[PDB]
Amino acid sequence: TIKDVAKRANVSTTTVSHVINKTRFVAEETRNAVWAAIKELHYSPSAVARSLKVNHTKSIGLLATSSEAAYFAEIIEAVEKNCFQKGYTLILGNAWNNLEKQRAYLSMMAQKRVDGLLVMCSEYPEPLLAMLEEYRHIPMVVMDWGEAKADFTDAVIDNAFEGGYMAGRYLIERGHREIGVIPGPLEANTGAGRLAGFMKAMEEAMIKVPESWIVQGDFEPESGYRAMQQILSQPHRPTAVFCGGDIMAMGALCAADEMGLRVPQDVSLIGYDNVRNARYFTPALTTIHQPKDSLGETAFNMLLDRIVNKREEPQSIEVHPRLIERRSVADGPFRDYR
Amino acid sequence: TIKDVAKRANVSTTTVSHVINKTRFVAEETRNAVWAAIKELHYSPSAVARSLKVNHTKSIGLLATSSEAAYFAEIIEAVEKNCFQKGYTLILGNAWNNLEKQRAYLSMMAQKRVDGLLVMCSEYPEPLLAMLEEYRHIPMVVMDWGEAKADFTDAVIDNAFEGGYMAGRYLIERGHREIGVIPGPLEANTGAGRLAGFMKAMEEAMIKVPESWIVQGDFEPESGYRAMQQILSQPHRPTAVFCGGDIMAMGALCAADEMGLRVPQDVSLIGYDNVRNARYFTPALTTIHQPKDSLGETAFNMLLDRIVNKREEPQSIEVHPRLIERRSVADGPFRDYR
DNA sequence: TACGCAAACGTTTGCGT
DNA sequence: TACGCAAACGTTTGCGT
Ligand SMILES: Nc1nc2[nH]cnc2c(=O)[nH]1
Ligand SMILES: Nc1nc2[nH]cnc2c(=O)[nH]1
Structure with missing residues (x-):
């Protein structure tokens, strides 16, 4: 001693x-x-x-949802790098969207007196929003809302809507008019928000998406698999598909292959996230890239600020997705007619 | 207060x-x-x-290597679950195989006085082994050695050698005699150890692997990509390939597809790890499964023991891989002749 | 019965001189 | 010059009665 x-x-x-x-x-x-x-x-x-x-x-807490998922995993590795360099220690928490679990980790965290809190809970029900407020005293930032649900936090916004829009536009511009969509959970931003951005472009183009062509997924490859199946497993099928997450895309790819459908020669597919190894999907996935490191670093930063320069006011920084062209999309029947 | x-x-x-x-x-x-x-x-x-x-x-520290990699990612999520339930808090540390970084995290950890230490550093040079000893006082277990390098820790062993063996045997039994291998880093267990287990079966079968057929990877999909390429990019090519990690396999798949080679109709490929979504690779990957949750839970357990029932002696528990048959392997030219 | 007083855990930091 | 004494941070836990 x-x-x-x-x-x-x-x-x-x-x-x-x-x-x-x-x-x-x-x-x-x-x-x-x-x-x-x-x-x-x-x-x-x-x-x-x-x-x-x-x-x-000099310790910070990440209340996430899950940490296996490619998407999340990459964000986390990002946040850790930043903690490491500014000398903070990261305490990782997976709540699996479980309220109980969530109240528990929140509590252990406060108790452990973390300097600030990084939140990535995917879905925010009032009960959750409510719990979170009870901790306004501990500095925090939610990194996954689409707009600023609350006034007691900093927030980084991903413009997921404008991503949905870009995706749809691409397909439209490649000649496609018969498109389907397998979206992520509507209770989540990256779910609802991307669908919507996608639906705007459609409506801007007077494209109508037959309900039998939209199938909910959950970001898990299995959901992708089933969705694609249900889609192509039908009399009339689209020529292209917008899938709200790369990992589900991965699954959507498999199934097509399993029905002996060719991508993109038979169906065109576009993803979303640009996860670390979407380039090695087969075929190389064409997707919308989400800035994961910047999402992390930016979050770590507003936190440190609030932490160090005792900031009291809620802040919010936008971030921007961008299209990555790879090999999973092919011209549609209307390319020549524009 | x-x-x-x-x-x-x-x-x-x-x-x-x-x-x-x-x-x-x-x-x-x-x-x-x-x-x-x-x-x-x-x-x-x-x-x-x-x-x-x-x-x-009531807080435990994971000194890992990286946490994005599928493989690692799954183990970690495992360990966290266990920490959560027995009421411990996980502090995650990525050292990227960096000594400096490693000495740093070790130090912050001791300082933060973690109850025990979970170590997953992939490669263990004496300098690392040395540092680790300086902390024998803090209870710990390394979860990735092949045998017990030291006496001052608990250890869980994965029998990676017997995995290598199973993989090779499979290929042999499917009719293959012309096989290649893209192994993981020889400085790592899951690298060296699986190769060796693979080479035993070969020698048991009097199969000789032409050096031009063995190409080092690093568990990263890119390494896989290049390796496969170099392999098939040659006059005489094998009919089957054993790839030391699913994610590299993923990359090896892509490249074949990119050369217009068909898997497994043109080349058979077998992986290793059975990562969460290898079933959705295209084609569905045939691989050796590594018990990741058990690897986690078992580790968390020996730690708690040492922690709770103040155990002083080094322990070691083996764990076992097993073959998962999927769709990436096809009979070889000698199947009928056995 | 059911509960308090006070010392201790290992530091940091104000005043001293 | 260059350094010490002692109180404080927020608890737990031994003895009390
Ligand atoms: N797994 C996963 N991927 C995502 N990509 C965008 N949002 C999500 C999410 O909530 N989960
Ligand atoms: N990424 C990765 N996958 C592995 N699978 C087995 N060992 C490893 C490793 O060190 N890294």
Whole structure:
């Protein structure tokens, strides 16, 4: 312990503490001795003691949903990098969209007194929004809303709507008029918001999407698989499909292949997320890219701000998706007619 | 603070503390009052203060390598589940195989006084093994060695060698005699160990692998891509390939497709890991499955043990891979001749 | 019966001189 | 000059009675 170090050095703990944090000038001679002891005694200064006094843990908490999913996984790795460099420690929490679970992690977190909170819960019911407020005191930012549901947080917005729009536009411009869509959960932003952006372009083009052509997924490859199936497993099928998430796309690809349908020669498919290895899908996936690192870094930043420069007001920063052309889309029947 | 609660309740903090932890009988009347205050004052008992006294943080640290990679990602989600249920908090650390980085996280961790340490560093150079020892005092288990490199840790072993063997055997038994291999980094267990297990079966079958047929990868889809290419991009090519990791396999698939080679009609491919969505690769990947949840849970368990029942001796538990047949393998030229 | 007083956990940091 | 004494951070837990 520090006392033990001070003794081996025959200096006061104050001195020990000062040399360890260079918070005041100490003589070389003195300072070496301290180091010496620190070394033999093999000292590890306790963060708990420290945090207890200085009042901050240099530790931040990520209340996510799941961390296996490619999408999430990439964001997280991002956030960790940032924590690491500004010297923060990341406490990861998966709540699986479970309220109970969510109230639990929130609670352990406050208790562990994290400096700030990163939230990525996918769906926000009032009960959740409500819980979150009970912690306005701990600084936080939600990284997955589409607009700013609340006033007690910072927020980074992904313009998912404008992504939906881009996707649809692309298909339209490639000659397609018979399109289907497998969207992600409507209770989520990246679900509802992308569908909507997609539907605007359709309506702008006077394209009507037969309900038998829209099939809900859940971002999981299985959902993709079933959706595609149900789509192509029908009398009249579209020539192209907009799928709200790369991993589901992955699944949508498999099924087509399984029905002996050729992509994109038989069906064109466009995804969304540009997950780390969508380029190695077969065929190489054409998708909308979501800035995951920037989404992370930007979030970590507004937090640190609030944390460091004691900011009180809610902030919000937009971020922008962009189209990545790969090999899963092919001209439609109307390309030549424009 | 607790003092503030005790006052609103006109009871001593001792009482407050007792009702909060039911560590001694308190009158209903009394106990309600406490709760009352706890409620208005909106109390969050500090874990730091607590940990400071009781000496444990109910918090565990995962020093990993990377957390985006499918493989790792799944293990982690596993470990978190377990932390959650036994009431521990997970602190995630990616060191990217960086010594400096590794010494840093190790250090922050000790400092943060984590109850135990989960290690998954992929490669273990003496310099790393050395650092690790300096922390024998903090309980730990490495979850990725093939045998027990040290005596100061628990260890879970994956029998990766017997996986390599199974893979090769399969190919042999399907009629293949001309096989190639794209292995993972030899400095890693899941790299070296699987190759070796694979090479034993070959030698048992008197199959010789021409060096021009073995190409190192790094578990990253790109490495897979290049490897396959180099393989098929040659006068004489094998009829089948053993690829040391599903994600590289994913890449190996893409490239074949890109050369207009058909899988498995032109080349047979077998992977390794059985990552969550290898079934949706195209074609559905035939691979060796690695028990990731059990790998996690088992690790979390030996830790808790050491943690709770103050175990001093090094333990080691094996785990077992098993073959999953999917659609990426086809009979070889010698099937009929056996 | 049912509960309090006070010391301790390991630091940091104000004043001293 | 260059450094010490002692109080404080927010708890838990031993003895009391
Ligand atoms: N798995 C997954 N992928 C996504 N991509 C966009 N939103 C999501 C989500 O909630 N889950
Ligand atoms: N990405 C990745 N996959 C693996 N599968 C087995 N070992 C590894 C590894 O070190 N990295």
